[PDB]
Amino acid sequence: MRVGLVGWRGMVGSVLMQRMVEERDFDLIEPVFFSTSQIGVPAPNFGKDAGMLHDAFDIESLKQLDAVITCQGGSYTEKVYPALRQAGWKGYWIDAASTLRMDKEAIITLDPVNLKQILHGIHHGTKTFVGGNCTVSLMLMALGGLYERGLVEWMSAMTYQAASGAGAQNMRELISQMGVINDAVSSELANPASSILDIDKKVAETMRSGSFPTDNFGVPLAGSLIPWIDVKRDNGQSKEEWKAGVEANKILGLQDSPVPIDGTCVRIGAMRCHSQALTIKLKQNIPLDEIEEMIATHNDWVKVIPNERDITARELTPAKVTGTLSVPVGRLRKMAMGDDFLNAFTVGDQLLWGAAEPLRRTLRIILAE
Amino acid sequence: MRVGLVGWRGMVGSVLMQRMVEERDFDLIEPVFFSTSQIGVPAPNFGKDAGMLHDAFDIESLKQLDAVITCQGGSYTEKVYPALRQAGWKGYWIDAASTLRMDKEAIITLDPVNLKQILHGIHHGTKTFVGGNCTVSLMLMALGGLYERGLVEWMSAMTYQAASGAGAQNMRELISQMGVINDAVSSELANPASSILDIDKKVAETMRSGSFPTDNFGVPLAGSLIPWIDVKRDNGQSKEEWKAGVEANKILGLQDSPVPIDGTCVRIGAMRCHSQALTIKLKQNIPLDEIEEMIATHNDWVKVIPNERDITARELTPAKVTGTLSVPVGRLRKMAMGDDFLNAFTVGDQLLWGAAEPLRRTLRIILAE
Ligand SMILES: NC(=O)c1ccc[n+]([C@@H]2O[C@H](COP(=O)([O-])OP(=O)(O)OC[C@H]3O[C@@H](n4cnc5c(N)ncnc54)[C@H](OP(=O)(O)O)[C@@H]3O)[C@@H](O)[C@H]2O)c1
Ligand SMILES: NC(=O)c1ccc[n+]([C@@H]2O[C@H](COP(=O)([O-])OP(=O)(O)OC[C@H]3O[C@@H](n4cnc5c(N)ncnc54)[C@H](OP(=O)(O)O)[C@@H]3O)[C@@H](O)[C@H]2O)c1
Ligand SMILES: O=C(O)c1ccc([N+](=O)[O-])cc1P(=O)(O)O
Ligand SMILES: O=C(O)c1ccc([N+](=O)[O-])cc1P(=O)(O)O
Ligand code: NA
């Protein structure tokens, strides 16, 4: 199988490359590396020589491939994909970008949840497989055990989203903001006789100053939060909030009778883990023991954390989860509203299950068929 | 009126002192400053001379006061209050601590919401007035318009709570953690060609290192979050999550038919403003514009922020609200679940309406009678 790699060099792509090396995916394919910036020089060597960098925009070159895996982004997909299909290419397009997710000829891939849908697609001529939004993938990796059994009536999701979803420059800006805050009060911070109100005043002033580094976010993130991600939609949702409902229901095959999913998506000062606080309305009063079992046994990465303070503080956080494939879920309990209302809190790495991991797993599934 | 000040030197106390000076509250009283560790030292001079610091545990000196305002804490209240009352003191005990909130003898003071309850109490011999929990006070300042009309069937609250709620040392530790994070990668950040994954790897290593300053939180807060605040209760709630339902319903006089309030309380890396993402179940499908009107007309400090991207990012954040008495609420819209589900996101300063302001306002109400 001859597989083209586009966007292998960037943040998401680099995570994907490391995972492909770790799982020895390159043993199974003939990789062809593409560039949007410079061609003809040696391709990267991740264990074996792959020749040269090819032109990511050349239709005839792409037509020679059995599949493309792209992390290059929506601008790239919009430019290349329609022409490539119009020219007769029947290969597999495996894409991280949002561009094609809701296309009638694309399947959103999250195989621990929807392997059966993926396999049906592959066997019946579907050639486009798109990774879902970070928030969607991470929520379903935590709650797949409930959703697969049709037990969810609706879900409200309030999120705590990392800088990495906006990009590497945004992550850098977050850390720079942290430095500028600390710099402003370093002379008084450690002195207990210094007024905490004076420290606080200076932090607030520094954050509000024009020179505070805010080119990417537009406003401060460190020391604060931003309760709006992406463009407004006419019903008053942000695009980020809208994605949850439409993508989750496509993945689950419920488009004609969807589970309502809604809430507020909030950016917070974390590097690359998204967390979500969920009000889950169950159709029936399911005992918490069964809920816990159904969640825990759904897949190999979800981890149900006991509902206790110390273990929660250690396990159910970005500090614990960052850079790992683990998807902890905790604070699982029935709520004051009734025994059909379930509280849950979950954390997951945005670059792994939220970006790169579904792409490499989709490749392995296609290979095995 | 002779008024004793206890806990005036701490964080909450210092905010109270600042506000009392700003509003010239000291012109209306005879202030007597007390201490737990500095007896005999000259008292602070806020305009006029108040002599020396008195003994906060000496019952007989406290007995000469017409009122006590205390920000010293629950363990202080636990020892001095019962002893002071039993010795026949009938003065006004005005307290920020949780200890007496749910005592039959005490009124929870949040006068923009429950002034009538407060005055009825004053007129019928109630002498104990206690500030509510920071999250409860801030939520009712935002949504008082809906609660006072009996429109809320239930509410789920997922919170984004600031460091100040845990204490001054915790705020310092947050800022220290921010510096330690930036320090670890400041060279790489200054080089525009550096690898984002390398920066990310170093940040994670730094946050996980034994040397990371985590004595007060127990785990990292900068770059992370902690989805547990305060001690565990038997039904799986933390004490922080439980406080909302019991305190709000007492403030609203709804103990005979309380509104269910529940959710997850999460500490994030903000300095001194709590934010809350609310799923509000309404009893009736009221038009959105009338909802906004009910909310906005309830009190002088609540503000409706239009549901638009740029203004939300600028106005509905800790960076905007910090150190002010403003209580913005935005992202007001009906949710996917139905037109009787209302999304709301609100931000408020933890030290003002969430701690010090109800104390000085209660003093002013008593004086005014
Ligand atoms: N999940 C997310 O993080 C997210 C969110 C929203 C949008 N996006 C979109 O998806 C795309 C991929 O996300 P990303 O975070 O992986 O983007 P990224 O790190 O900026 O990488 C994107 C591309 O930039 C090019 N590039 C230019 N200079 C580079 C340098 N010095 N180092 C590495 N690459 C360089 C590379 O393509 P060549 O090798 O062809 O030059 C690379 O594949 C983004 O460009 C963006 O449009 C991603
Ligand atoms: N939900 C919660 O659990 C929660 C939330 C907020 C506050 N609280 C509690 O409420 C109380 C007041 O809160 P806070 O944040 O104002 O506490 P704080 O800043 O520690 O002040 C409390 C007292 O500590 C003493 N103190 C000792 N060293 C000091 C120093 N270097 N500078 C200033 N004061 C010093 C002061 O009393 P003297 O002048 O008598 O020495 C002061 O009145 C605390 O006991 C806190 O634990 C609890
Ligand atoms: O917006 C997105 O969801 C998204 C996610 C990942 C990637 N990238 O290819 O890894 C790109 C996009 P987008 O559609 O380019 O903005
Ligand atoms: O726990 C609380 O709610 C609380 C809040 C404020 C204050 N303090 O006096 O300002 C003290 C307490 P706590 O009852 O001491 O823990
Ligand atoms: Na700026």
Residue type, A267: R
Q: A143 C-alpha to center of ligand 1: Å? A: 30
Give CA A323 to chain center in angstroms. Answer: 13
CA distance linking residue B336 with residue B341, whole number of Å: 8
CB-CB contact of B333 with A236 (8 Å):
yes
Q: Which of A46, A37, A39 is nearest to A61 (CA)?
A: A39
Which DSSP state fits B243?
H
A233 is in an annotated binding site: no
Beta carbons within 10 angstroms of residue B64's beta carbon:
12
Which DSSP state fits B164?
G
Does residue B258 have its Cβ closer than 6 Å to ligand 4? no
CA distance linking residue A251 with residue A23, whole number of Å: 25
Q: Which of B158, B103, B107 is nearest to B135 (CA)?
A: B158
Length in residues, chain A: 369
CA distance linking residue A23 with residue A17, whole number of Å: 10
B-chain residue closest to A330, CA distance: B227
CA distance linking residue B259 with residue B150, whole number of Å: 9
Place of tokens 């933390």: B238
**CA of A243: how far to CAs of A112, A186, A251, in Å?**
20, 42, 12
**Hey, which of B98, B109, B230 would you mutate to test ligand 4's pocket, going by the most ligand atoms within 8 Å of its Cβ?**
B98
B69's enclosing H/E stretch is strand B67-70
Q: Which of B249, B233, B20 is nearest to B133 (CA)?
A: B249
Beta carbons within 10 angstroms of residue B272's beta carbon:
27
CA distance linking residue A250 with residue B159, whole number of Å: 30
Residue B218: what are its φ and ψ, rounded to 5°? 95, -25
SS (H, E, C) chain A: CEEEEECCCCHHHHHHHHHHHHCCHHHHCEEEEEECCCCCCECCCCCCCCCECEECCCHHHHHCCCEEEECCCHHHHHHHHHHHHHCCCCCEEEECCCCCCCCCCEEEECHHHHHHHHHHHHHCCCCEEEECCHHHHHHHHHHHHHHCCCCEEEEEEEEEECHHHCCHHHHHHHHHHHHHHHHHHHHHHCCCCCCHHHHHHHHHHHHHCCCCCCCCCCCCCCECCECCCCCECCCCCEHHHHHHHHHHHHHHCCCCCCCCEECCCCECCECCEEEEEEEEEECCCCCHHHHHHHHHCCCCCEEECCCCHHHHHHHCCHHHHCCCCCEEEEEEEEECCEEEEEEEEEEEECCHHHHHHHHHHHHHHHHHC
Ligand nearest to the CA of B163: 2
Tell me the Ramachandran region of residue B160: left when phi exceeds 0, alpha when psi lies from -120 to 50, beta otherwise: beta
CA distance linking residue B165 with residue B161, whole number of Å: 7
Q: How far apart are the first and last CA of chain A?
A: 12
Interaxial angle between packed helices A11-22 and A357-368, expressed in degrees from 0 to 180 and rounded to the nearest 10: 50
Which 3 state secondary structure label does DSSP give B107? Answer: strand
What is the sign, positive or negative, of the torsion defined by CA atoms of A263, A268, A274, A276? Answer: negative
Q: A177 C-alpha to center of ligand 5: Å? A: 10
CA distance linking residue B367 with residue B256, whole number of Å: 32
* H runs (alpha helix) in chain B: 11-22, 59-62, 74-86, 111-123, 134-147, 168-190, 196-208, 239-251, 288-296, 309-315, 318-321, 357-368
Gap positions in chain A, given as the residue before each gap (C–N > 2.5 A)?
none
A165 is in an annotated binding site: yes
CA angle B281, B261, B233 (to 5 degrees): 150
Residue type, A368: A
Q: Which of A143, A152, A98, A91 is nearest to A297 (CA)?
A: A143
Which DSSP state fits B337?
T
CB-CB contact of B317 with A226 (8 Å):
yes
Which residues, in sequence order, are CB contacts of A151 under 8 Å at separation 6+?
A282, A283, A284, A286, A294
CA distance linking residue A219 with residue B319, whole number of Å: 8
Which residues of chain B does A14 touch, with a Cβ-Cβ cutoff of 8 Å?
Answer: 195, 197
CB-CB contact of A254 with B321 (8 Å):
no
A343 with B262: Cβ contact below 8 A: yes
Give CA A35 to chain center in angstroms. Answer: 24
Cβ-count burial A265-274 (b if 16+ within 10 Å, e if not)? bbbbbbbbbb
Backbone Cα Rg of chain B: 22
A367 touches B: beta carbon within 8 Å: no
A231 touches B: beta carbon within 8 Å: yes
B160 with A268: Cβ contact below 8 A: yes
B155's enclosing H/E stretch is strand B152-160
What is the sign, positive or negative, of the torsion defined by CA atoms of B139, B143, B144, B147? Answer: negative
CA distance linking residue B355 with residue A112, whole number of Å: 47
Q: How many CA atoms lie within 13 A of A38 on its CB side?
A: 5
CB-CB contact of B159 with B136 (8 Å):
no
Task: Tell me which architecture the domain covering B134-350 has in CATH.
Answer: 2-Layer Sandwich (3.30)
Q: Which of A127, A156, A145, A69 is nearest to A303 (CA)?
A: A145
Q: Which fold has domain A1-133+351-369?
A: Rossmann fold (3.40.50)
What is the sign, positive or negative, of the torsion defined by CA atoms of B190, B196, B202, B203? Answer: positive
CB-CB contact of B171 with B163 (8 Å):
yes
B213 is in an annotated binding site: no
Active-site residue, selected from the candidate residues B54, B71, B134, B273: B134
How would DSSP label each residue in B10-55? SHHHHHHHHHHHHTTGGGGSEEEEEESS-TTSBPP-BSB---B-EE
Checking A210-215 for CB contacts under 8 A at 24+ apart, the result is A212/A177, A212/A180, A213/A173, A213/A176, A213/A177, A213/A180, A214/A173, A214/A177, A215/A173
CA distance linking residue A171 with residue A173, whole number of Å: 5
CA distance linking residue B303 with residue B327, whole number of Å: 6
Question: What's the gap in Å between the CA of A239 and the closest CA on chain B?
Answer: 11
**CA of A250: how far to CAs of A97, A244, A253, A314, B335, in Å?**
16, 10, 5, 34, 19
Residue A265 annotated among the catalytic residues of the structure:
no
| The token pair that represents B56 in the structure block | 């906060």
B308 is in an annotated binding site: no
Place of tokens 């500030």: B131
Task: Please identify among residues 165-194 of chain A the ones whose CB lies closer than 8 Å to any CB of chain B.
Answer: 168, 171-172, 175-176, 178-179, 181-183, 185-186, 189-190
| The token pair that represents B155 in the structure block | 């509410």
CA distance linking residue A131 with residue B72, whole number of Å: 54
| Burial of A82: CB neighbours in 10 Å, binned 0-12, 13-18, 19+ | exposed
CA angle A52, A56, A62 (to 5 degrees): 90
Structure-determination technique: X-ray
CB-CB contact of A288 with A334 (8 Å):
yes
Residue B330: what are its φ and ψ, rounded to 5°? -150, -160
Tell me the Ramachandran region of residue A303: left when phi exceeds 0, alpha when psi lies from -120 to 50, beta otherwise: beta
* H runs (alpha helix) in B229-308: 239-251, 288-296
Question: What's the gap in Å between the CA of A60 and the closest CA on chain B?
Answer: 33
CA angle B346, B267, A181 (to 5 degrees): 85
| The token pair that represents A140 in the structure block | 């379903």
Length in residues, chain B: 369
A283 touches B: beta carbon within 8 Å: no
CA distance linking residue A322 with residue A318, whole number of Å: 5
| Burial of B336: CB neighbours in 10 Å, binned 0-12, 13-18, 19+ | buried
Place of tokens 């210094």: A194
Q: Which of A213, A221, A205 is nearest to A176 (CA)?
A: A213
Pairing of strands B92-95, B128-131: parallel
CA distance linking residue B227 with residue B161, whole number of Å: 10
How would DSSP label each residue in B306-333? PS-HHHHHHHSSHHHHTTS--EEEEEEE
Beta carbons within 10 angstroms of residue A331's beta carbon:
24
CA distance linking residue B202 with residue B158, whole number of Å: 31
CA angle B119, B121, B126 (to 5 degrees): 135
Which residues, in sequence order, are CB contacts of A20 under 8 Å at separation 6+?
A26, A46, A360
Ligand nearest to the CA of A176: 5
**CA of B347: how far to CAs of B145, B200, B261, B267, in Å?**
16, 30, 18, 14
Q: Which of B247, B346, B236, B225 is nearest to A344 (CA)?
A: B236
CB-CB contact of A355 with A134 (8 Å):
yes
Which of B201, B219, B231 minimises the CB distance to A313? B219
Residue A58: what are its φ and ψ, rounded to 5°? -85, 110
CA distance linking residue A240 with residue A173, whole number of Å: 21
Q: Which of B314, B231, B329 is nearest to B275 (CA)?
A: B329
Question: What's the gap in Å between the CA of B61 and the closest CA on chain A?
Answer: 28
**CA of A323: how far to CAs of A136, A274, A362, B180, in Å?**
18, 12, 21, 20
**CA of A58: how far to CAs of A39, A64, A69, B15, in Å?**
11, 11, 15, 65
Which DSSP state fits B260?
P
Q: B170 C-alpha to center of ligand 2: Å? A: 12
Residue type, A271: M
Residue B183: what are its φ and ψ, rounded to 5°? -50, -40
CA distance linking residue A113 with residue A289, whole number of Å: 21
Which of A197, A225, A245 minimises the CB distance to B317? A225
Which 3 state secondary structure label does DSSP give B147? Answer: helix
CA distance linking residue A134 with residue A131, whole number of Å: 9
| The token pair that represents B204 in the structure block | 């994670």
| The token pair that represents B179 in the structure block | 């510096």
A-chain residue closest to B311, CA distance: A228
CB-CB contact of A349 with B197 (8 Å):
no
Q: What is the stated resolution of the deposited model, in angstroms? A: 1.9
CA distance linking residue B194 with residue B184, whole number of Å: 14
Residue B124 annotated among the catalytic residues of the structure:
no
**CA of B133: how far to CAs of A158, B97, B166, in Å?**
22, 8, 12
A-chain residue closest to B342, CA distance: A263
| The token pair that represents A112 in the structure block | 């621990």
Q: Which of B63, B56, B91, B60 is nearest to B77 (CA)?
A: B56
Residues lining ligand 5 (ion), CB within 5 A? A 212, 214
Pairing of strands A327-335, A302-304: parallel
**Which residues share a beta bridge with B92?**
B67
A214 touches B: beta carbon within 8 Å: no
Which 3 state secondary structure label does DSSP give B129? Answer: strand
CA distance linking residue A44 with residue B29, whole number of Å: 77
Domain coordinates of chain A in residue numbers?
1-133+351-369, 134-350
CB-CB contact of A18 with A44 (8 Å):
no
| The token pair that represents B245 in the structure block | 């339902």
Residue B129: what are its φ and ψ, rounded to 5°? -130, 125
Which of B160, B175, B309 minimises the CB distance to A225? B160
CB-CB contact of B308 with B334 (8 Å):
no
A192 is in an annotated binding site: yes
| The token pair that represents B139 in the structure block | 């939520």
Which 3 state secondary structure label does DSSP give B357? Answer: helix
